[PDB]
Amino acid sequence: DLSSRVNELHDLLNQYSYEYYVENPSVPDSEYDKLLHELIKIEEEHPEYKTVDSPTVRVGGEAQASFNKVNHDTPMLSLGNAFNEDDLRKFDQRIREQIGNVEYMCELKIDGLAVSLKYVDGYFVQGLTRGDGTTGEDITENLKTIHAIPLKMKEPLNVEVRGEAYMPRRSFLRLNEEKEKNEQLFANPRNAAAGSLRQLDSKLTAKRKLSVFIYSVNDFTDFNARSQSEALDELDKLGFTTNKNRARVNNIDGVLEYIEKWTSQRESLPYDIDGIVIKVNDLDQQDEMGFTQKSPRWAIAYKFP
């Protein structure tokens, strides 16, 4: 009986949540809240309209995260480090000696909490902490409260994406301010985000302002991407939140320019970064480079001093 208004509230809340948490709102907080409250009331009085990907999932539930030890479908990578220009030049020289001139993708390394996010038939069904890279903790219920994480992708794929969960600097500072006025302060946004995702109650996680950036996928089968940068664009089209500050560059001069630029611009960002990740862009060329015992030979994490 209430299908039209429920579908209308789904459509409006999903569009508004995307514009705010992924993109410029077209609507004030008061309008989002009013529509959210109305959907919550319909679902309380008519629970047959509840759905797995309802916008009301974002406020958190009674069901708690299990924190069960769960294996990733595919182990998560450990990156080798660079600490100066020389290290980047060595890494570039190792690659060009072996496979020739390559295009690099450069990305900001968010000072966040690494997660794997598993999608089955396009639905978000499992979110794990990175753990030891092989085994993680099940924090699905808490991750579901993060609006930047789609509950349902644009296409019904079976994929495991890798992301960095984080707390925006402004939200971190405002939280410590509330603590200062009333409690012990969090040391940094990373610790505040970790505290928020360790809650027994997802309703507590929901009242913290968290976001994510997706940086990779486990499996490129259902992707038409030939490169890391194309794969991130494809992820955008599928409904995920990626970091827009990535760049394709032709050579090591380009990589150095991007590091020097972001050294000077990192204070301007709304999140903490601890580095810059540089990767061979082409997927076939990443494959050609292969791995060491621990780490890809086609990627490196430059770390700020």
Ligand SMILES: Nc1cccc2cn[nH]c12
């Ligand atoms: N933390 C990370 C590990 C492996 C790859 C990437 C890409 N951006 N951040 C990454």
Ligand SMILES: Nc1cccc2cn[nH]c12
């Ligand atoms: N990450 C997302 C993808 C598509 C729609 C929405 C609404 N909130 N977050 C979304």
Ligand SMILES: Nc1cccc2cn[nH]c12
């Ligand atoms: N890592 C940090 C510690 C204390 C304050 C701030 C603000 N942005 N990042 C911060």
